[PDB]
Design a binder for this molecule. Structure first.
Ligand SMILES: Nc1ccc(O)c(-c2cc(C(=O)O)ccn2)c1
Ligand SMILES: [Cl-]
Ligand SMILES: [Cl-]
Ligand SMILES: [Mn+2]
Ligand SMILES: [Mn+2]
Ligand SMILES: [Zn+2]
Length: 351
């Protein structure tokens, strides 16, 4: 009730940290959770105006996009399935050229609602190319604040313990977008946190569903896609499923929306379903991370059961280290802990 009194509407919150607050990443995450930001599943953090992760983005024209994907979308009435078609490798220069070309460039519009309507109206036409899942970073090696390449959260325990790297999850990914490129409805692998930084370019728009309401979205999605639901216990993790905000409203699924500008951070929280699209040519960097609060989510995450090489992180080291008194019960399959999506991560006891 202390936590349930904070952000009771579960709306997307925006934060403007000072440079002092901005330096300690995990601490500021704990803070915004103390303010109830996590209840939305998504939050925006606008960094100090003097902070910059890179002096200049003029040298990256020759950066290679090894596996650009053409996004074919099929559907109607607010329900869509996205099929990825991998294209030949190409450079950022070659990508931007195509992105800004007359055929793929952003349509003209007044307010955001107009561009949003055009997105949902034309989603299945003129399939765009997304320069997605590029291994790398655009942070300068010296930037110590909010460095996606080295956030130093307890997610580091995975590699530290096993040597295992999972691309885009405990390593950084770059996303080069063009108009009408999409990311489908999903939570993160193992229901982790994620961080997303829009380095440059046109905006990225987001939809989010509160974790305390995530199950309702799942039930809706299973109803809409019964074939997919029968074939996999977590088919949304395929990240192929697009659902319009009008469809969510029609079925009483609560949600919020936010538009991300260049130079801005987006944080997604455990079991926070989100989706969205890019307004035009841009570039974003992202990875996943953890807090102590995530551990229970990780233990209870419902994973994909049909796809091989799907991301499954062993929770053992986390339970042993941060829940020693529950380790035996958990191994015996008798840990029946129930998650309260309103509670902030325990690191926020300072606040
Ligand atoms: N395929 C995938 C996996 C995990 C993710 O977290 C995302 C994702 C991508 C974007 C993006 O395309 O910028 C935004 C939010 N989530 C995509
Ligand atoms: Cl699912
Ligand atoms: Cl990612
Ligand atoms: Mn995501
Ligand atoms: Mn189906
Ligand atoms: Zn599956």
């Amino acid at each position: 009730s202390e936590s349930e009194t904070l952000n009771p509407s579960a709306r997307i919150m925006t934060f403007y940290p000072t440079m002092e607050e901005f330096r300690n990443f995990s601490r500021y995450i704990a803070y915004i959770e103390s303010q109830g930001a996590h209840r939305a599943g998504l939050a925006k953090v606008v960094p100090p105006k003097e902070w910059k992760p890179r002096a200049s983005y003029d040298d990256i024209d020759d950066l290679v996009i090894p596996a650009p994907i053409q996004q074919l979308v099929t559907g109607q009435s607010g329900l869509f399935t996205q099929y990825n078609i991998q294209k030949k490798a190409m450079t950022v220069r070659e990508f931007r050229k195509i992105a800004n070309s007359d055929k793929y460039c952003t349509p003209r519009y007044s307010e955001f609602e107009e561009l949003e309507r055009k997105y949902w109206k034309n989603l299945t036409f003129n399939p765009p190319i997304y320069g997605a899942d590029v291994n790398g970073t655009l942070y300068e090696k010296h930037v110590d604040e909010w460095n996606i390449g080295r956030l130093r959260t307890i997610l580091d325990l995975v590699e530290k313990e096993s040597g295992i790297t999972i691309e885009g999850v405990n390593t950084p990914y770059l996303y080069f977008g063009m108009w009408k490129t999409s990311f489908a409805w999903h939570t993160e692998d193992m229901d982790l946190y994620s961080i997303n930084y829009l380095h440059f370019g046109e905006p990225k728009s987001w939809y989010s569903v509160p974790p305390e309401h995530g199950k309702r979205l799942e039930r809706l999605a299973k109803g809409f896609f019964p074939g997919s639901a029968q074939s996999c216990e977590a088919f949304l993790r395929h990240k192929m499923t697009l659902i319009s905000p009008l469809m969510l409203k029609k079925y009483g699924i609560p949600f919020d929306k936010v538009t991300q500008e260049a130079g801005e951070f987006m944080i997604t929280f455990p079991y926070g379903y989100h989706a969205g699209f890019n307004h035009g040519f841009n570039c974003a960097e992202s990875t996943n991370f953890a807090t102590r609060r995530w551990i229970e989510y990780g233990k209870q995450a419902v994973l994909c059961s049909c796809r091989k090489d799907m991301v499954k992180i062993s929770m053992d080291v986390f339970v042993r280290k941060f829940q020693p008194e529950r380790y035996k019960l958990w191994k015996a399959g008798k840990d029946n802990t129930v998650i309260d999506h309103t509670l902030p991560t325990p690191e926020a006891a300072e606040f």
